Design an enzyme around this catalytic site. Structure first.
Site, PDB file in Angstrom:
ATOM      1  N   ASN A 116     -10.136  -6.573   4.541  1.00 21.78           N
ATOM      2  CA  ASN A 116     -10.052  -6.207   5.882  1.00 21.78           C
ATOM      3  C   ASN A 116      -9.518  -7.488   6.904  1.00 21.78           C
ATOM      4  OD1 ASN A 116      -8.374  -3.610   4.397  1.00 21.78           O
ATOM      5  ND2 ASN A 116      -9.614  -2.076   6.124  1.00 21.78           N
ATOM      6  N   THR A 174     -14.033   3.337   3.445  1.00 22.08           N
ATOM      7  CA  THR A 174     -14.144   3.005   2.647  1.00 22.08           C
ATOM      8  C   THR A 174     -15.917   3.898   2.346  1.00 22.08           C
ATOM      9  OG1 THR A 174     -12.626   1.147   2.873  1.00 22.08           O
ATOM     10  CG2 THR A 174     -13.853   0.953   0.919  1.00 22.08           C
ATOM     11  N   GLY A 202       0.665  -1.384   0.284  1.00 15.22           N
ATOM     12  CA  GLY A 202      -0.031  -0.105  -0.068  1.00 15.22           C
ATOM     13  C   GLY A 202       0.534   1.509   0.382  1.00 15.22           C
ATOM     14  N   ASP A 207      -6.271  -4.735  11.384  1.00 18.38           N
ATOM     15  CA  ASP A 207      -5.998  -3.180  10.590  1.00 18.38           C
ATOM     16  C   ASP A 207      -6.469  -2.192  11.749  1.00 18.38           C
ATOM     17  OD1 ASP A 207      -4.294  -4.107   8.634  1.00 18.38           O
ATOM     18  OD2 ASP A 207      -6.735  -3.817   7.129  1.00 18.38           O
ATOM     19  N   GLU A 229       1.279 -12.027  14.061  1.00 14.54           N
ATOM     20  CA  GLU A 229       0.711 -13.584  13.599  1.00 14.54           C
ATOM     21  C   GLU A 229       0.165 -13.339  11.934  1.00 14.54           C
ATOM     22  OE1 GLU A 229      -2.350 -16.019  15.917  1.00 14.54           O
ATOM     23  OE2 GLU A 229      -3.000 -13.225  16.512  1.00 14.54           O
ATOM     24  N   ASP A 273     -12.764   0.507  10.143  1.00 12.62           N
ATOM     25  CA  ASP A 273     -12.293  -0.015   9.051  1.00 12.62           C
ATOM     26  C   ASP A 273     -13.099  -1.543   8.590  1.00 12.62           C
ATOM     27  OD1 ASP A 273     -10.479   0.308   6.999  1.00 12.62           O
ATOM     28  OD2 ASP A 273      -8.278  -0.286   8.048  1.00 12.62           O
ATOM     29  N   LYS A 324     -14.037  -4.654   5.965  1.00 18.37           N
ATOM     30  CA  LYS A 324     -14.983  -4.493   4.444  1.00 18.37           C
ATOM     31  C   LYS A 324     -13.962  -5.966   4.405  1.00 18.37           C
ATOM     32  CE  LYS A 324     -11.118  -1.697   3.383  1.00 18.37           C
ATOM     33  NZ  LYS A 324     -11.148  -0.043   2.153  1.00 18.37           N
TER      34      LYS A 324
END
Ligand SMILES: N#Cc1c(N)ccc(/C=C2/CCCNC2)c1Cl
Lengths: 353, 19
Positions: A174, A204, A55, A187, A124, A169, A171
């Site tokens: 993710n 988003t 990213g 995240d 992890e 965040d 979605k």
């Protein structure tokens, strides 16, 4: 009434046991929030294997710990790029949150360190890849399959909200699937410790609640809106609000006129109309009964919340895993050098990391 | 159909955050 004596007593006891769990969890979080850990390894302790994601800030690489052979996912953030993109606070906050939280569906931070050029978070490795991939591969999830994942998100948000963390965040891109088929949330760059209202435009388009789009302030109920979007997309195969351009998506969200596939059950449509509720005085998760309006909804009547938390429910999908370090459930990305400058960059901005 | 409209939107792959 809807419950006889035994069922009512059992539900009441369950709900009070949640309160007792959360009170202890908050105490534990706050101790770590106030005393974070730092500098627990160094780069040459690890072999770099493969890039798992890239990213604007950096990338995430599968690595192997040389002394033990264990595999991990290492997020590498370029300090200069973080400063340029005005993400210093998000980066420091993400690390601070990850090292303080503890929940079975939240990824664990195993090591962190920094050098002249980069910041490193060693987490992890979650080998099943993204929910997004699996959803697009099979089109849509049956309602029981969607419900298994949704239940994990409900419990995770119940936990986070008890800590006064808003997530912001959610979605399928993710959410990662572990070897046992359970979901991992990784995240925290958009998460914020918020006891009342906040205003930031972030997220988003398809997953934004109306009150994030609109200038008014908002609260943790945006996460329950986002859960509605997720459940809808998992069960339909497409999200409830889409269009060619984000501004047109926003127009649809703030109208909030939601239509459903003909295969959705009536229970599912009722749940979603109560999560995808524009009116904050009516949205499930934001009423006097809190998360219990969601957890006690008919669509969840078959869900054993404790068994999900204990990871004792058989998952609907178990990823294929061919051996330690297998990356066959992830997309391929271009492999770039990990350069470390001879000179320290942005030292004072990242002292706390 | 709604699904065909989804495909036509071009937003069927991974979606970026606003910032
Ligand atoms: N395993 C693993 C793992 C992890 N512990 C943390 C992050 C990522 C990758 C991304 C990049 C796309 C946006 N979400 C984060 C991965 Cl793949």
């Amino acid at each position: 009434g809807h419950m006889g004596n035994a069922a009512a007593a059992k539900k009441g006891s369950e709900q009070e046991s949640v309160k007792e769990f959360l009170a202890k969890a908050k105490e534990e979080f706050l101790k770590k929030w106030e005393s974070p850990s730092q500098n627990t390894a160094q780069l040459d302790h690890f072999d770099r294997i493969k890039t798992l994601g890239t990213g604007s800030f950096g990338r995430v690489m599968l690595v192997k710990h040389k002394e033990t052979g264990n595999h991990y996912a290492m997020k590498i953030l370029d300090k200069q790029k973080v400063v340029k993109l005005k993400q210093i606070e998000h980066t420091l906050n993400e690390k601070r949150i990850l090292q303080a939280v503890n929940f079975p569906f939240l990824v664990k931070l195993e090591f962190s360190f920094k050098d002249n050029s980069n910041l490193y978070m060693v987490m992890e490795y979650v080998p099943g890849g993204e929910m997004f991939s699996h959803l697009r591969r099979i089109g849509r999830f049956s309602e029981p399959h969607a419900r298994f994942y949704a239940a994990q998100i409900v419990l995770t948000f119940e936990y986070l909200h008890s800590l006064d963390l808003i997530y912001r965040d959610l979605k399928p891109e993710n959410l990662l699937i572990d070897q046992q088929g359970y979901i991992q949330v990784t995240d925290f760059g958009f998460a914020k410790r918020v006891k009342g209202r906040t205003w930031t435009l972030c997220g988003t388009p398809e997953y934004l609640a109306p009150e994030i789009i609109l200038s008014k302030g908002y609260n943790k109920a945006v996460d329950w809106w986002a859960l509605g979007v997720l459940i809808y997309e998992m069960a339909a195969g497409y999200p409830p609000f889409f269009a060619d351009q984000p501004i047109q998506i926003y127009e649809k969200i703030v109208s909030g006129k939601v239509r459903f596939p003909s295969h959705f059950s009536s229970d599912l449509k009722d749940l979603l109309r109560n999560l995808l509720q524009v009116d904050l005085t009516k949205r499930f998760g934001n009423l006097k009964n809190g998360v219990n309006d969601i957890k006690n909804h008919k669509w969840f009547a078959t869900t054993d919340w404790i068994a999900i938390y204990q990871r004792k429910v058989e998952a609907p999908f178990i990823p294929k895993f061919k051996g330690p370090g297998d990356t066959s459930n992830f997309d391929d990305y271009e492999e770039e050098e990990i350069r470390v400058s001879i000179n320290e960059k942005c030292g004072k901005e990242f002292t706390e990391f | 159909t709604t699904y065909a409209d989804f495909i036509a939107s071009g937003r069927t792959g991974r979606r970026n955050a606003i910032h």
